[PDB]
Write a protein that holds these residues in place. Sequence first.
Motif: not given
Lengths: 197, 106, 172, 49, 127
Positions: E19-22, E28-34, E37-42, E45-50
């Motif tokens: 997330h936010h690699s873009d 870096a684009e390498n996967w990395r898990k959020q 505490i507030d994070s949409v991705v973690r 929330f409908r709308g974001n990256i899986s």
Amino acid sequence: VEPVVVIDGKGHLVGRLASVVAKQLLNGQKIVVVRAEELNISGEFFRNKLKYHDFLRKATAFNKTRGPFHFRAPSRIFYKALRGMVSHKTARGKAALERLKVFEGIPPPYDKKKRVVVPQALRVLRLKPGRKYTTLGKLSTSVGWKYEDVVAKLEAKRKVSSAEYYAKKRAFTKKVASANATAAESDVAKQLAALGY
Amino acid sequence: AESHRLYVKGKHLSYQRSKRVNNPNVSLIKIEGVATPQDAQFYLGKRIAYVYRASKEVRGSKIRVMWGKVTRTHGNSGVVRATFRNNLPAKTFGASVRIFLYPSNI
Amino acid sequence: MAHFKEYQVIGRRLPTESVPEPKLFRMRIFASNEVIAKSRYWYFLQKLHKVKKASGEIVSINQINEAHPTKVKNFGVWVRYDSRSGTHNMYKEIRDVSRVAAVETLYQDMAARHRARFRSIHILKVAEIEKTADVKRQYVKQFLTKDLKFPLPHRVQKSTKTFSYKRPSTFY
Amino acid sequence: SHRKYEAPRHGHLGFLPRKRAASIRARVKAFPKDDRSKPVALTSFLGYK
Amino acid sequence: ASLPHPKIVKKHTKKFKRHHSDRYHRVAENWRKQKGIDSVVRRRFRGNISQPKIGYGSNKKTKFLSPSGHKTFLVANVKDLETLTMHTKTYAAEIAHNISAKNRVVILARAKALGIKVTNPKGRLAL
RNA sequence: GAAAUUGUUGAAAGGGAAGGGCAUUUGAUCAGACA
RNA sequence: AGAACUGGCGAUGCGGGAUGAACCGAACGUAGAGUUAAGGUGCCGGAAUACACGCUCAUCAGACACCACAAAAGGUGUUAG
RNA sequence: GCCCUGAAAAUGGAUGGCGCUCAAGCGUGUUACCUAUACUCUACCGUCAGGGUUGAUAUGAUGCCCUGACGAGUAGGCAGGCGUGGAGGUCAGUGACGAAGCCUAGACCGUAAGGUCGGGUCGAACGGCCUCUAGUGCAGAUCUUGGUGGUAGUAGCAAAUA
RNA sequence: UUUGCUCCACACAAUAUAGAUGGAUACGAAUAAGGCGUCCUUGUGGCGUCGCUGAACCAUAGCAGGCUAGCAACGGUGCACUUGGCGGAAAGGCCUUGGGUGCUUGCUGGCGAAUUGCAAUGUCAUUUUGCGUGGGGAUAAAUCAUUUGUAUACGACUUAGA
Ligand SMILES: [Mg+2]
Ligand SMILES: [Mg+2]
Ligand SMILES: [Mg+2]
Ligand SMILES: [Mg+2]
Ligand SMILES: [Mg+2]
Ligand SMILES: [Mg+2]
Ligand SMILES: [Mg+2]
Ligand SMILES: [Mg+2]
Ligand SMILES: [Mg+2]
Ligand SMILES: [Mg+2]
Ligand SMILES: [Mg+2]
Ligand SMILES: [Mg+2]
Ligand SMILES: [Mg+2]
Ligand SMILES: [Mg+2]
Ligand SMILES: [Mg+2]
Ligand SMILES: [Mg+2]
Ligand SMILES: [Mg+2]
Ligand SMILES: [Mg+2]
Ligand SMILES: [Mg+2]
Ligand SMILES: [Mg+2]
Ligand SMILES: [Mg+2]
Ligand SMILES: [Mg+2]
Ligand SMILES: [Mg+2]
Ligand SMILES: [Mg+2]
Ligand SMILES: [Mg+2]
Ligand SMILES: [Mg+2]
Ligand SMILES: [Mg+2]
Ligand SMILES: [Mg+2]
Ligand SMILES: [Mg+2]
Ligand SMILES: [Mg+2]
Ligand SMILES: [Mg+2]
Ligand SMILES: [Mg+2]
Ligand SMILES: [Mg+2]
Ligand SMILES: [Mg+2]
Ligand SMILES: [Mg+2]
Ligand SMILES: [Mg+2]
Ligand SMILES: [Mg+2]
Ligand SMILES: [Mg+2]
Ligand SMILES: [Mg+2]
Ligand SMILES: [Mg+2]
Ligand SMILES: [Mg+2]
Ligand SMILES: [Mg+2]
Ligand SMILES: [Mg+2]
Ligand SMILES: [Mg+2]
Ligand SMILES: [Mg+2]
Ligand SMILES: [Mg+2]
Ligand SMILES: [Mg+2]
Ligand SMILES: [Mg+2]
Ligand SMILES: [Mg+2]
Ligand SMILES: [Mg+2]
Ligand SMILES: [Mg+2]
Ligand SMILES: [Mg+2]
Ligand SMILES: [Mg+2]
């Protein structure tokens, strides 16, 4: 059904006319509305006049330009009614509106083209008789539209020519009907009656 | 003659959707002169071509077609559901579409 | 509440050693199904006797069908109803062709003129007004005049296509 | 809060925008109402101050 | 000429980028898990990256198979390449990236004789 | 001899930000498999 | 501001209530087909400008829980008692 | 009962908007229809569980085969893995006929950490497996040092007579 | 500045396309009233008839519609020409004349069609532009700089210069 559908505004209810015109567009159907000055709105003139002045006071406080614009012409009162029924800020939205055209009176091309009506928006089929209602021309001119009298003039002129047209037409169809009547009783005629014609 | 049409005119309406989420895998089709779910049951399984043009010639033509079939009726006013080989481009909401008469059963 | 049937509901006070064969009471009940109808029965019975379903039993449930279902009849209707600020007794007369029809539009009428939902109404009696000129309410007397004839002005035909090529006519 | 003392504004908003004119030759936005009974003549003239 | 297999179904062919690699070069684009505490991705929330998860794991029947049917096997020299002699329908040799040119020609040469598939038979090919 | 950041060339998009998700059209590009 | 019991939010997305921590529905591996919930079906917007009986005309009508307010008091407006 | 009076606030504005008046309004009935990560059925991944199977003469016994249920997650626990510098063993591993490194909206394997290859650049070293070891993985700390931007060809370069 | 421009004609080529695929098929006005036919005293007139949906009307057969012959009618229609007339609300289109010419499925004949293989839009529309050719026609200006001050922060404005 047809490449272009020209609707005679006269005797139609603004928001019902708007509601069907919007959906037609979105479905790919070009539309022109005419005689928009002869559009109707339920409720007595005074109400829809006040309603208009409520619209009339909303403006961007810091700059009356950027704020909401108030068009006073009946076509354009109508377009407001429509645009509100169309997601007009999407590309698909802009797309459908370009299929639309509204006019006061019936200007060239469309005046020799047939115009239709929209029964589920026809005031005389819809308003309970007795209820008060409003004519756009009358409303618009009360809020500043400049061109009621000219439209009246031009139409009355148009309206003369087309009665010529009609009467001339009515006379030829009488010939045709006469022509049809000798053909009645002939074999081919009785045969076609068999086949529902 | 002047008419050659062996299909029925149709209109690409929406994707399948909620208020706020659509489903590009199912398209919704308005078939001319079909007013009721009963009327539309006739067209179930008929095949639908969306035909369109392009700049690059390919197999000798500048005309291409997406294909699919009608699949079920949709609500009370004759509208129909249909799925295609590849989903339809969404700029086509409003575009015409051809519904054919095969596979026939008359 | 729905489209009504009318039922005879018979019930009685669970038997005992010292009192077997208890008295048996009947109600006619207007209801959409026999489930609502037995409920309703117990609802009124506990308003009149010392019973409750727990200690009582339903004996028979039978649908009463209209005697002459294609004869126009003048019904007088008595009702009890709860308004927002207190409760009230009423008399209406309804003209239709079955008691079941009649109760359908009573309920509609209470709802629409007095905003009374189905819970707040008690039918007291529904009974066919035998001889005319006992018909009291004028909105019914109206329809009893000899050689009655009235036109239906301003005809609206329902369009089937969105567009029309005519201009309609409400003639009739 | 509120002006404390009241005074009229400053300048007339019927003359906005206060920009340079599109041309040195100001425009006649209005001619006299036509009385077609009278003889034909002009209804304005050109001159130099 | 690979073993037969079921249709090879990939399940999610799109890369799982961070997330936010873009958004910032420093990410870096390498996967990395959020872990925010507030994070949409973690929070999903409908709308974001899986995010990668074990649902996506490939069919045990076709996993590791590449388009042709053969699992691939890295190869440095002939000895290695020969480890696939009784496995031609199952493995393809990939010639290691640091093998020389004059050695690649010996290895292709043999893979031919042995009927073993090579996946990158054009590396360094002096044309 | 990386990156930030820059020049040039080439391709593309742009009505008050941009970037992102699912999906497909169109362009470009490419693997595999046929035998 | 402070207690009781439960259920929640916090730690949780998904559908609905335009919007929103807590309401309503429903709790999440990757997907296909089907059916629904709560909520909706004039147009925006998927889905009857559906059927039926009344009611209501407002020179500031009204329009759906939680929720985004109104009261006493009045009307020879109209409706049924 | 509905409606009307009672009913006064500050940028222009909100039954969500348009608009709707025998409603697209209020009360009530009847159907049909739309659609959630939920319900039913199916495939696939994983987790837990229960069975089966050391009989050689080929390839995993922590394996192989059958079957059933289940899958939210902060703080937190544990597990199985990915990657780095150095160490023991081994492949008699790769390499000046090009090691390492760097570049590449080219290819492939993995759910993922990552792995693999092609092409370009380059110039002397380097890697797989089993094990050992730790100064072992960054986006944040007004983090440290170094380098670089937008700001911007912008503020400005006007005291002391020329 | 290297023969440039324009209207018409066809030719090659590109580039498009919010979506051809028989026909957008013309009174007005009223709706507790109207259309149409007819008569007459010409009217807020008599008499007749119609609606209850365009489910109509028109068109529609022929290698996507080939090559041909004849008859009956004297009609229909395409096309380029020509006669007169109308339309300025955006008229940019509508009507009338006359010869020519093509077609006619009004009727009756001769010939063709296959192998596109049991479906694959099976390609028949209209947008814009570019480049040559030759049938008409046409031969400018604006800007910089200079200059005025009815103008001006700079641009801009306004004058002037064979
Ligand atoms: Mg009876
Ligand atoms: Mg003051
Ligand atoms: Mg200017
Ligand atoms: Mg992180
Ligand atoms: Mg935060
Ligand atoms: Mg939080
Ligand atoms: Mg150097
Ligand atoms: Mg994509
Ligand atoms: Mg906390
Ligand atoms: Mg939750
Ligand atoms: Mg939501
Ligand atoms: Mg709300
Ligand atoms: Mg509850
Ligand atoms: Mg909207
Ligand atoms: Mg819809
Ligand atoms: Mg229905
Ligand atoms: Mg309440
Ligand atoms: Mg009160
Ligand atoms: Mg009252
Ligand atoms: Mg309101
Ligand atoms: Mg609404
Ligand atoms: Mg209702
Ligand atoms: Mg699912
Ligand atoms: Mg979990
Ligand atoms: Mg490790
Ligand atoms: Mg290491
Ligand atoms: Mg170290
Ligand atoms: Mg890059
Ligand atoms: Mg490869
Ligand atoms: Mg190389
Ligand atoms: Mg190298
Ligand atoms: Mg060296
Ligand atoms: Mg180790
Ligand atoms: Mg450290
Ligand atoms: Mg980090
Ligand atoms: Mg850093
Ligand atoms: Mg930072
Ligand atoms: Mg961090
Ligand atoms: Mg830093
Ligand atoms: Mg400088
Ligand atoms: Mg400066
Ligand atoms: Mg200074
Ligand atoms: Mg100076
Ligand atoms: Mg000085
Ligand atoms: Mg387009
Ligand atoms: Mg008549
Ligand atoms: Mg007449
Ligand atoms: Mg008459
Ligand atoms: Mg007709
Ligand atoms: Mg022909
Ligand atoms: Mg026009
Ligand atoms: Mg012939
Ligand atoms: Mg030329």
